[PDB]
Design a protein around this ligand. Structure first.
Ligand SMILES: COc1cc2cc(OC)c1OC/C=C/CCOC(=O)[C@@H]1CCCCN1C(=O)[C@H]2C1CCCCC1
Length: 128
C-alpha cells in the first residue's frame, strides 16, 4: 500500500534523521520556491491512522485546509513536511508519534503513540 511504499522508498526529512517523518513525492510541482515559516498555506489532504480505524479528508469539508506554516497550528510533521513542498506538488508522509500526537495522543480522535499517514497537495502559499 501507499504507506508501505513510504516505509520502503521514502526520504527521511527530519533533522535528527530518526525516520520520524518520511516523504515521497507523488506528483512533481512547479517552481523552485517552497513555503517559508509564517507563510499562509493552502492544501488539500487525506489522512489516516496506521491502525486503519480513522480517516479524514479536507475534501469532505468542501474547503481547502489553510494554516500558517511554523505557527504551531498543525503537527510538527506538517510544518516540516509542507516546508519541503512546491506549488502544485502532491506528497505522501508517514509519521511517527514524536512528530504527531506523541504518547498522550489526542483522545479519542488520535490514540496514544499513533503513527499517521497523509497524502497532501500544496495548492498555494502566500506571504504574511
Ligand atoms: C479536521 O479535524 C481534525 C483532523 C485531524 C486532527 C484533529 O485534531 C485531533 C482534528 O480536529 C481539529 C484539529 C485540527 C488541527 C490538528 O491536526 C493536524 O495538525 C493534522 C494536520 C492538519 C490536518 C488534520 N490533522 C490531523 O491530524 C487529522 C487526523 C484525523 C484522524 C486521522 C489522522 C489525521
Amino acid at each position: 500500500g501507499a504507506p508501505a511504499t513510504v516505509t520502503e522508498q521514502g526520504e527521511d526529512i527530519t533533522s535528527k534523521k530518526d525516520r520520524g517523518v518520511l516523504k515521497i513525492v507523488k506528483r512533481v510541482g512547479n517552481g523552485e520556491e517552497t513555503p517559508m515559516i509564517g507563510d499562509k498555506v493552502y492544501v488539500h489532504y487525506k489522512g489516516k491512522l496506521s491502525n486503519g480505524k480513522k480517516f479524514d479528508s479536507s475534501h469532505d469539508r468542501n474547503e481547502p485546509f489553510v494554516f500558517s506554516l511554523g505557527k504551531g497550528q498543525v503537527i510538527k510533521a506538517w510544518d516540516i513536511g509542507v516546508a519541503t513542498m512546491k506549488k502544485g506538488e502532491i506528497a505522501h508522509l508517514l509519521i511517527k508519534p514524536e512528530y504527531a500526537y506523541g504518547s498522550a495522543g489526542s483522545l479519542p480522535k488520535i490514540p496514544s503513540n499513533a503513527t499517521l499517514f497523509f497524502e497532501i497537495e500544496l495548492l498555494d502559499f502566500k506571504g504574511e
